[PDB]
Amino acid sequence: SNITYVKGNILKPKSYARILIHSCNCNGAWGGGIAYQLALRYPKAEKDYVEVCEKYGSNLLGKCILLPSYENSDLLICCLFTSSFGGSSHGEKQSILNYTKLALDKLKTFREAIGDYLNGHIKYPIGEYKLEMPQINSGIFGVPWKETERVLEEFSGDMSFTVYQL
Numbered sequence: 181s182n183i184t185y186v187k188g189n190i191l192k193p194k195s196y197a198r199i200l201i202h203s204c205n206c207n208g209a210w211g212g213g214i215a216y217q218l219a220l221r222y223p224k225a226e227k228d229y230v231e232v233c234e235k236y237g238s239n240l241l242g243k244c245i246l247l248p249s250y251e252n253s254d255l256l257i258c259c260l261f262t263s264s265f266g267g268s269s270h271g272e273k274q275s276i277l278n279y280t281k282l283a284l285d286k287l288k289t290f291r292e293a294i295g296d297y298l299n300g301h302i303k304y305p306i307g308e309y310k311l312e313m314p315q316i317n318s319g320i321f322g323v324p325w326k327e328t329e330r331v332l333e334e335f336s337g338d339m340s341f342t343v344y345q346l
């Protein structure tokens with residue numbers, strides 16, 4: 181009930197400010213799926229994500245980082261670090277779900293008051309950005325969407341999400 185589902189591609193431009201949340205590996209590889217689509221469009225954000233992975237590696241698990249898209253001041257990117265490696269070496273389902281919860285809790289705390297790269301690029305107060313995501317964990321990471329959906333619903337009354345379905 182804190183989730184609104186919309187049909188369509190999350191990368192089609194929107195008039196309002198938003199944070200695009202997606203699930204990431206800690207290996208500096210936006211290599212497939214939605215992450216690769218972000219790498220094509222937002223190469224400076226990919227650079228930041230790679231830099232954070234190179235510095236902290238899997239110590240990032242259960243954390244998130246907020247990045248400018250740089251190309252559109254109405255679009256930030258929120259990377260949830262939920263697996264050490266991408267592709268077929270991704271972590272087990274319970275690991276990914278636990279880290280998804282922990283990473284979203286850090287996003288929740290940050291909005292209430294992760295944001296190193298926002299300095300000098302964030303146009304609005306962070307609370308003014310809508311929270312949007314594809315069906316994270318359900319593609320390359322192989323987690324049935326209903327299990328991630330239950331994680332999102334743990335934040336009812338704290339955060340609301342718009343989830344895109346192709």
Ligand SMILES: Nc1ncnc2c1ncn2[C@@H]1O[C@H](COP(=O)(O)OP(=O)(O)OC[C@H]2O[C@@H](O)[C@H](O)[C@@H]2O)[C@@H](O)[C@H]1O
Pocket residue numbers: 188189190191202203204205209210211212213214215216217265266267314315316317318319320321322344345346
């Ligand atoms: N523009 C898009 N718009 C809306 N939905 C999309 C889009 N692109 C993909 N999707 C949907 O989002 C689902 C999740 O996409 P994945 O990229 O497979 O994400 P995930 O399962 O969370 O795996 C994360 C892993 O893959 C890479 O994205 C990332 O580098 C990480 O290692 C996909 O199954 C797909 O159905």
